[PDB]
Each structure stands twice: as C-alpha cells, then as structure tokens.
Symmetry: C2
Subunit: 52 residues, 2 copies
C-alpha cells in the first residue's frame, strides 16, 4: 500500500529518531505526494535534532 504502510514506517522512523538515532534513514523522501512532503519534513526535523 501507498499511504497506510508508509505512514506506519515514518511513525516508526520518528520514534527511532526521538529515542536518539539521529542517523536513521527517513524513508519515502522521493515521493511527489503528501507522503513525500511529510517525509521531507521528517528529514528536516532529523537534521534539526543534529543540533546536539
């Protein structure tokens, strides 16, 4: 699936990043849809966390 599964994966990614894996790879960045924008923004959050 194109929406439900990617949402689940990104949620797992946010938590991985939140628990302190600033090196996690954020999936779906190459999407041209709402999943793509969401994943691009999750990537920018990750980079923002790389603050310390």
């Amino acid at each position: 699936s194109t929406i439900t599964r990617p949402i689940i994966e990104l949620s797992n990614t946010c938590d991985k990043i939140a628990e302190g894996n600033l090196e996690a790879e954020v999936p779906h960045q190459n999407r041209a849809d709402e999943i793509g924008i969401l994943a691009k923004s999750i990537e920018r959050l990750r980079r923002s966390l790389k603050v310390a």
Copy 2:
C-alpha cells in the same frame, strides 16, 4: 487522510525551523495518523530534551 498528512508536514517544518512549541494536531486519533502524530509529538519533545 491527505489533509492530516499535510497539516503534520507543515507542523514538522514549523518545529524544524525552531518553533519547538508548535502544537501537534491529530494525536487523539485511533488510526495510523494518530500514531504518526504522537510519534511527531515525541520527536518534538526530543528536540527540547536535546
């Protein structure tokens, strides 16, 4: 669920730009958007904890 996805993307960017106080919508949902929102809320809290 296109709308909540867009809103959350906007929310993520607001936080990534430095507004670590931006309220994360959709957290009280039972579905996959609900977990996503909570995971983004926990990510918001982490930027602070850091």
